Motif scaffolding. Structure first.
Motif, mmCIF file in Angstrom:
data_model
loop_
_atom_site.group_PDB
_atom_site.id
_atom_site.type_symbol
_atom_site.label_atom_id
_atom_site.label_comp_id
_atom_site.label_asym_id
_atom_site.label_seq_id
_atom_site.Cartn_x
_atom_site.Cartn_y
_atom_site.Cartn_z
ATOM 1 N N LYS A 133 0.873 -1.174 0.000
ATOM 2 C CA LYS A 133 0.000 0.000 0.000
ATOM 3 C C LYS A 133 0.895 1.205 0.000
ATOM 4 O O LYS A 133 1.665 1.402 0.957
ATOM 5 C CB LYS A 133 -0.931 0.007 1.204
ATOM 6 N N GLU A 173 0.162 -9.198 4.046
ATOM 7 C CA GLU A 173 -0.170 -10.467 3.459
ATOM 8 C C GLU A 173 -1.038 -10.272 2.217
ATOM 9 O O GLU A 173 -1.940 -9.435 2.210
ATOM 10 C CB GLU A 173 -0.906 -11.283 4.532
ATOM 11 N N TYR A 174 -0.765 -11.042 1.178
ATOM 12 C CA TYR A 174 -1.506 -10.968 -0.071
ATOM 13 C C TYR A 174 -2.725 -11.886 -0.022
ATOM 14 O O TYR A 174 -2.625 -13.044 0.367
ATOM 15 C CB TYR A 174 -0.607 -11.357 -1.249
ATOM 16 N N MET A 175 -3.878 -11.338 -0.392
ATOM 17 C CA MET A 175 -5.164 -11.998 -0.390
ATOM 18 C C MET A 175 -5.696 -11.969 -1.811
ATOM 19 O O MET A 175 -6.224 -10.962 -2.284
ATOM 20 C CB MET A 175 -6.077 -11.212 0.554
HETATM 21 C C1 LIG Z 1 -9.437 -3.934 -1.309
HETATM 22 C C2 LIG Z 1 -8.737 -3.139 -2.381
HETATM 23 C C3 LIG Z 1 -7.431 -3.413 -2.727
HETATM 24 C C4 LIG Z 1 -6.698 -4.559 -2.141
HETATM 25 C C5 LIG Z 1 -6.042 -4.377 -0.900
HETATM 26 F F1 LIG Z 1 -6.173 -3.191 -0.245
HETATM 27 C C6 LIG Z 1 -5.281 -5.327 -0.249
HETATM 28 C C7 LIG Z 1 -5.105 -6.588 -0.858
HETATM 29 C C8 LIG Z 1 -4.315 -7.669 -0.236
HETATM 30 N N1 LIG Z 1 -3.851 -7.592 1.005
HETATM 31 O O1 LIG Z 1 -3.941 -8.634 -0.947
HETATM 32 C C9 LIG Z 1 -5.748 -6.794 -2.076
HETATM 33 N N2 LIG Z 1 -5.736 -7.935 -2.867
HETATM 34 C C10 LIG Z 1 -6.521 -7.647 -4.007
HETATM 35 C C11 LIG Z 1 -7.052 -6.363 -3.930
HETATM 36 C C12 LIG Z 1 -6.578 -5.803 -2.745
HETATM 37 C C13 LIG Z 1 -7.978 -5.841 -4.977
HETATM 38 C C14 LIG Z 1 -8.497 -7.005 -5.791
HETATM 39 C C15 LIG Z 1 -7.376 -7.901 -6.312
HETATM 40 C C16 LIG Z 1 -7.836 -8.877 -7.414
HETATM 41 C C17 LIG Z 1 -6.710 -9.803 -7.851
HETATM 42 C C18 LIG Z 1 -9.059 -9.684 -7.006
HETATM 43 O O2 LIG Z 1 -8.185 -8.065 -8.570
HETATM 44 C C19 LIG Z 1 -6.717 -8.597 -5.118
HETATM 45 C C20 LIG Z 1 -6.753 -2.652 -3.685
HETATM 46 C C21 LIG Z 1 -7.446 -1.595 -4.338
HETATM 47 C C22 LIG Z 1 -8.734 -1.294 -4.014
HETATM 48 C C23 LIG Z 1 -9.386 -2.070 -3.032
HETATM 49 N N3 LIG Z 1 -10.746 -1.728 -2.713
HETATM 50 C C24 LIG Z 1 -11.739 -2.417 -3.374
HETATM 51 O O3 LIG Z 1 -11.446 -3.251 -4.222
HETATM 52 C C25 LIG Z 1 -13.107 -2.056 -2.988
HETATM 53 C C26 LIG Z 1 -14.154 -2.738 -3.610
HETATM 54 C C27 LIG Z 1 -15.461 -2.419 -3.248
HETATM 55 C C28 LIG Z 1 -15.725 -1.448 -2.318
HETATM 56 C C29 LIG Z 1 -14.702 -0.761 -1.684
HETATM 57 F F2 LIG Z 1 -15.020 0.094 -0.741
HETATM 58 C C30 LIG Z 1 -13.335 -1.032 -2.015
HETATM 59 N N4 LIG Z 1 -12.263 -0.320 -1.497
HETATM 60 C C31 LIG Z 1 -12.458 0.905 -0.714
HETATM 61 C C32 LIG Z 1 -10.915 -0.690 -1.783
HETATM 62 O O4 LIG Z 1 -9.997 -0.109 -1.266
#
Ligand SMILES: Cc1c(-c2c(F)cc(C(N)=O)c3[nH]c4c(c23)CC[C@H](C(C)(C)O)C4)cccc1-n1c(=O)c2cccc(F)c2n(C)c1=O
Length: 261
Positions: free
Chosen positions: A37, A82-84
């Protein structure tokens, strides 16, 4: 304090943009898959966060997204976690058998019971910051981070991004956060899970939601939730914080409903 050298990180894919800016997938020292991040300047109180990051490292639980370290000898700072691979739970839900929905609630409740035992408040529990790994396991992320947010749209009670729909009356009235405000938010999260990611109180604005909650009104039972499951989420929404259960109690309630259903 676990300072990570940025020279030990690779940047492999862009995952999108969150509240704090760009998030990337990469590797740390060729060993761990990580989310990186990149905290845009002006979005977070870095000094206050860095002090708390030492406490956040020591939080370790299988259902909590692990903080691996930080890169702070630069701006923007990096938070390495950690990657999710399946991203956030809200989008995962929106893209299941009832037994899988309860297992998602169990996963989060295990993480929250651990945080409750450490007297560590999440402060913004919701499906959007729960994450999902490659095996469909849900984990809690971004715990405690909302205390360091600088944008008024997120911090003010009348801001466009304040989580009014996940907040108990004492938060809306007095900004009084406690383990019991995390319990309230958990109930709303269970509602989100059983509603497959519908917005809570979608028919109302944020102002109308605060008024509805003040009158004693609550979210209705989602059709995928049984009466036993709804009793658990509804117990989280007692008007009085002290009458809400602990995460320890909630976990036992969930395990009982699982064994029974
Ligand atoms: C979570 C998120 C992440 C994000 C993160 F931070 C941490 C990790 C982790 N630790 O691995 C992580 N892993 C992946 C993502 C992701 C995103 C999806 C990836 C795939 C490979 C699946 O395309 C995999 C990154 C950007 C935006 C958001 N994000 C959303 O996607 C989102 C949706 C609805 C509503 C919301 F409010 C959202 N908000 C606010 C937001 O920040």
């Amino acid at each position: 304090h676990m300072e990570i050298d940025p020279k030990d990180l690779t940047f492999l894919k862009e995952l999108g943009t969150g509240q704090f800016g760009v998030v990337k997938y990469g590797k740390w020292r060729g060993q761990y898959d990580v989310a990186i991040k990149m905290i845009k300047e002006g979005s977070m109180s870095e000094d206050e966060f860095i002090e708390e990051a030492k406490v956040m490292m020591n939080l370790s639980h299988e259902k909590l997204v692990q903080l691996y370290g930080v890169c702070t000898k630069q701006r923007p700072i990096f938070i390495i976690t950690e990657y999710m691979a399946n991203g956030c739970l809200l989008n995962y839900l929106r893209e299941f058998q009832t037994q899988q929905l309860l297992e998602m609630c169990k996963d989060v409740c295990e993480a929250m019971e651990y945080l409750e035992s450490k007297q560590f408040l999440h402060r913004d529990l919701a499906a959007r910051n729960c994450l999902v790994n490659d095996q469909g396991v849900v984990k809690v992320s971004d715990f405690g981070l909302s205390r360091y947010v600088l944008d008024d749209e997120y911090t003010s009670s009348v801001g466009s991004k304040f989580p009014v729909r996940w907040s108990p009356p004492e938060v809306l009235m007095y900004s009084k956060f406690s383990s019991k405000s995390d319990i309230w938010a958990f109930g709303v999260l269970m509602w989100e899970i059983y509603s497959l990611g519908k917005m809570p109180y979608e028919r109302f604005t944020n102002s109308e939601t605060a008024e509805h909650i003040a009158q004693g009104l609550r979210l209705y039972r989602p059709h995928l939730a049984s009466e036993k499951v709804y009793t658990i989420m509804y117990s989280c929404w007692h008007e009085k914080a002290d009458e809400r259960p602990t995460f320890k109690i909630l976990l036992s309630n969930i395990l009982d409903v699982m064994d029974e259903e």
